[PDB]
């Protein structure tokens, strides 16, 4: 409604770095807000794509951003009659970023790992890894919970059970208020997908450079399964947290699995012990239901509501014809111990191949009416197909069915404007929460400042 579309701020990164692929707000110890931006194709030391992270200070005029430096050198450790190896080439550092407290977590989902033992190996595979930083103090740490030292032969003998060699840990990431890092690894357990959790504090205090394989006792990974309904489901393709069980001492996880059950797709709500509380099945095969998930209370009843994107949903049109436009589903949380019923609202895209629902951002309460609102991305929508972000306002009954505002991409075709969104944070300290929109195709970020309502 009241996002200022006339005077935007632009941050830009190196060409071909995919600057803006992921982003988040970041408050230092003093509460000063900055933007953290992932650029998963930034060049490394050997002029080879390794990805990179940038920490952009708030400036009304934007501009260039300083790097958040991480170690990009491959590592080798000859220990226990074995050889441990990390490969950061094309690792995609910054494919996701999330900020909690004064810490920044930037993940490299396709960082590769291997173990050699004489003439045998574990296999060079993308276990992924996360780089944690405390910018002010300069502290650095890592977390790579899918790394292992089991040889290839052993997996074969065990029928490839508990195989975490292709986790791609950090594909998606979230941090609970308590400070527990939760990493989605859609390739885990031979492409079933797994979640990995561990306290940020414990990740830091147990990490030391050079070790490569260390224990984080307090960590907690989800489980493997023999059920084919989970095969190639990419469980952990997207993740979020929230309160869905009443008990405020417990935090519940929300996991998207867009290819679950033979591409029907699903999203599940779980407890911290990975026990399923609810499951929401997709409406249409290959719609990629679960591609994105958002958690926010939109009807001001204090109960967190769930939003699920299905960017490839095909709408039914005249003469028995389907048009791929994308769809978003709203599930309102019922009073007390009860199951989430049918979706309360279906938002469908308009532009063909627009991919409406690829990203969904809670905005907080944008117009200050007492209800939280959201933004939905259609990275290839708009009449021009250059991309579009649509704002939907909350209300007592859920959400408005029509958008209160439409942000058209200021960038050229192919910028993927909206592929990443983040809101609910007042960056200029003007009393209204603001929106930051990534456009990795154009290697830029746009900041939309919310202003007092005009009407």
């Amino acid at each position: 409604l009241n996002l200022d579309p006339v005077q935007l701020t632009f941050y830009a990164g190196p060409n071909g770095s995919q600057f803006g692929f992921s982003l988040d707000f970041h408050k230092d110890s003093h509460g000063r807000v900055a933007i953290v931006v992932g650029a998963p194709r930034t060049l490394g030391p050997s002029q080879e794509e390794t990805g990179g992270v940038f920490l952009c200070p708030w400036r009304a005029e934007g501009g260039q951003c300083p790097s958040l430096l991480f170690d990009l050198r491959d590592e080798t450790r000859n220990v226990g009659s074995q050889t441990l190896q990390t490969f950061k080439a094309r690792q995609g550092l910054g494919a996701s970023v999330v900020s909690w407290s004064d810490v920044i977590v930037a993940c490299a989902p396709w960082q590769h790992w291997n173990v050699l033992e004489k003439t045998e190996e574990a296999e060079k595979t993308p276990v992924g890894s996360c780089f944690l930083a405390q910018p002010e103090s300069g502290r650095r740490a890592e977390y790579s919970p899918c790394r292992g030292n089991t040889l290839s032969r052993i997996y074969v003998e065990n029928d490839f059970s508990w195989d975490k060699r292709y986790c791609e840990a950090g594909f998606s990431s979230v941090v609970t208020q308590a400070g527990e890092l939760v990493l989605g690894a859609p390739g885990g357990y031979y492409f079933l997908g797994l979640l990995a959790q561990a306290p940020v504090a414990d990740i830091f205090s147990s990490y030391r450079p050079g070790i490569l394989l260390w224990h984080v006792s307090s960590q907690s990974l989800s489980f493997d399964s023999s059920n084919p309904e989970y095969f190639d489901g990419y469980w952990g393709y997207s993740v979020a947290v929230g309160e869905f069980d009443g008990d405020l001492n417990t935090t519940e996880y929300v996991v998207g699995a867009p290819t679950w059950s033979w591409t029907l797709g699903a999203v599940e709500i779980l407890d911290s012990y990975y026990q399923r509380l609810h499951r929401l099945r997709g409406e249409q095969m290959a719609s990629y239901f679960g591609h994105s998930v958002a958690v926010t209370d939109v009807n001001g009843d204090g109960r967190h509501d769930l939003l699920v994107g299905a960017p490839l949903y095909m709408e039914s049109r005249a003469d028995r014809k389907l048009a791929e436009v994308g769809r978003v589903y709203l599930f309102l949380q019922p009073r007390g111990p009860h199951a989430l019923g049918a979706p309360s609202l279906l938002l469908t895209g308009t532009q063909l191949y627009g991919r409406f629902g690829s990203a969904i951002a809670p905005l907080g309460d944008l117009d200050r009416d007492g209800y939280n609102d959201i933004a939905v991305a259609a990275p290839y929508g708009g009449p021009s197909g250059r991309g579009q972000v649509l704002v939907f306002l909350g209300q007592s009954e859920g959400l408005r069915s029509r958008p209160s505002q439409v942000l058209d991409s200021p960038f050229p075709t192919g910028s993927a404007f909206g592929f990443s969104l983040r809101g609910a944070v007042d960056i200029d300290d003007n009393g209204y929460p603001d929106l930051i929109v990534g456009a990795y195709g154009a290697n830029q970020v746009a900041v939309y400042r919310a202003q007092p309502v005009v009407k």
Partner: antibody, heavy 119, light 108 residues
């Protein structure tokens, strides 16, 4: 707090078999590797072997192959070390060990189990 | 097997001294070494791991160093408790191997 409660002192005769235990307290035995170490006054410290209680796979120093047998029961959260065909040279204090962070380290030790072989 | 020549076998020193034990390997072990302490009539306690890293709860007066096949545990300002047996251990290769040991005795 991590603690390894090893079984009490053992006093057996030559040729017999003994089985030592190492119960984990404050953590799951399945968490990390579990090594066994033999100690004698003159000879010093000798690494016997290790076990991964999760899957049961073991490794031994070829000096102890046949003599020592390391097992683990995740149920009782305990790791064991069995010594067969005992002799005088088997008279030593035995320790169970596990790493702190580093997968391959030797940081936490049990109080130790004294074994004496005599007729 | 990798041999660990740990010297000296013993040394007589007083409180507040700064002493350094050394450890030589029969080959390179790239910092894959650990240092242990055994107070008289008691079990073992981890001091250092992977060359230089202090085990949780260990006084900072302890410190590990060195590379290749030579390493050193150093104790700055000796304390009354520090008078005990110290061993080094390599886990660069299986089987793991220990040093001869070093007893810190009081001088007079």
């Amino acid at each position: 707090e991590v603690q390894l409660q090893q079984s009490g002192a053992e006093l057996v005769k030559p040729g017999a078999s003994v089985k030592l235990s190492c119960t984990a307290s404050g953590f799951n035995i399945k968490d990390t590797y579990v090594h066994w170490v033999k100690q004698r006054p003159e000879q010093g410290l000798e690494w016997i072997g290790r076990i991964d209680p999760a899957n049961g796979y073991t490794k031994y120093d070829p000096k102890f192959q046949g003599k020592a047998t390391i097992t683990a029961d995740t149920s009782s959260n305990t790791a064991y070390l069995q010594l067969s065909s005992l002799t005088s040279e088997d008279t030593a204090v035995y320790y169970c060990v596990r790493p702190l962070y580093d997968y391959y380290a030797m940081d936490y030790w049990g109080q130790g189990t004294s074994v004496t072989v005599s007729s | 097997d990798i041999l660990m020549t740990q010297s000296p076998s013993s040394m007589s020193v007083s409180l507040g001294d700064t002493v350094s034990i050394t450890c030589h390997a029969s080959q390179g072990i790239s910092s894959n070494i650990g240092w242990l302490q055994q107070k008289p009539g008691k079990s073992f306690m981890g001091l250092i791991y992977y060359g230089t890293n202090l085990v949780d709860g260990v006084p900072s007066r302890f410190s590990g160093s060195g590379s290749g096949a030579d390493y050193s545990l150093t104790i700055s300002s000796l304390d009354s408790e520090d008078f005990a047996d110290y061993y080094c251990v390599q886990y660069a290769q299986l089987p793991y191997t220990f040093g001869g040991g070093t007893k810190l005795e009081i001088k007079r």
